[PDB]
Amino acid sequence: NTKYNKEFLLYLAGFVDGDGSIIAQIKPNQSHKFKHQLSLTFQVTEKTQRRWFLDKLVDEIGVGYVRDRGSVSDYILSEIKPLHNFLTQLQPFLKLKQKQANLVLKIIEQLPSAKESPDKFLEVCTWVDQIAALNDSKTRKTTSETVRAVLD
Amino acid sequence: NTKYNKEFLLYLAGFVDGDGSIIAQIKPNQSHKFKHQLSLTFQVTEKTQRRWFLDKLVDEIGVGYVRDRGSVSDYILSEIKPLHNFLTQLQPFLKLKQKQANLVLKIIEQLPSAKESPDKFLEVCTWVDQIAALNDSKTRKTTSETVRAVLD
DNA sequence: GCGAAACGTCGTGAGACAGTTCCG
DNA sequence: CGGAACTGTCTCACGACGTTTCGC
Q1: Cβ count near A98 (within 10 Å)
Q2: What protein family is recorded (chains A, B)?
């Protein structure tokens, strides 16, 4: 848990707004409370030849990894706790994704209760419909509704 | 000849590096001595759904304009004088496009004595080649070599 | 049972030029 | 005759999720 240089956040808030992404997801899983996994993700992608930029971030941010997928590379940050600490100091400098950052940031803060009640789960399980709304979704295939149908 | 707030440049440079582009071209024009216009363009592309961001930009930068290519839109800035003043103050903040920038500045500076000796001209066409090299060039024709049809 | 890397993919939403006017 | 406006689009470079894998 740390605080980063105001100027690093300012510039990174710019790069995240451009070629960046703040994803929320309801990954359906068995070994998991109600058959689904509550997953939160922060990523930045770029041409593999410019991979260094991403690798740099792994060093500066202090967490997360970088992966290869063809003619492109990605920086992945999903450690729910340091994710909360990161989306904490950067959420203000955002301009195009400030909305969908908070929700993510305001779901973790309630993730323990999640499991609890199905009408307590669905709750959170909605925000992750909002964010998905705010982004530019085009291949979504699992919503609160599909997990509404958790009727046994 | 306005100066900007650092918190605006630090962030815009981040953006620019993300969904931005710093072009330079040899538009073959029939008027013009050597029959080739040197053109420089600063621009930022975005889905017409978020053009209010491109507009505040026009207002924030104090110069330039927005266009409409249907689904996406751009913020265009070509006037040399303004272009030179903007690109001088953003330059120390860019990270993946900081060079390309400088070559544009350099060019601007030589633009005048650039159409003196046919050879002092090709030297700048080279400043240009260098630039498209730094970009993700994919559909370019007229180069410093294409121009070799002037020495004759 | 949880959270967490590790691995794959659709369909753009951006980017880096080319062309051809319009003033003055 | 130099310089922006208006205008046209080819080719990726992204953004945004999708099934796998599994020990702590």
Answers
A1: 16
A2: Belongs to the LAGLIDADG endonuclease family.
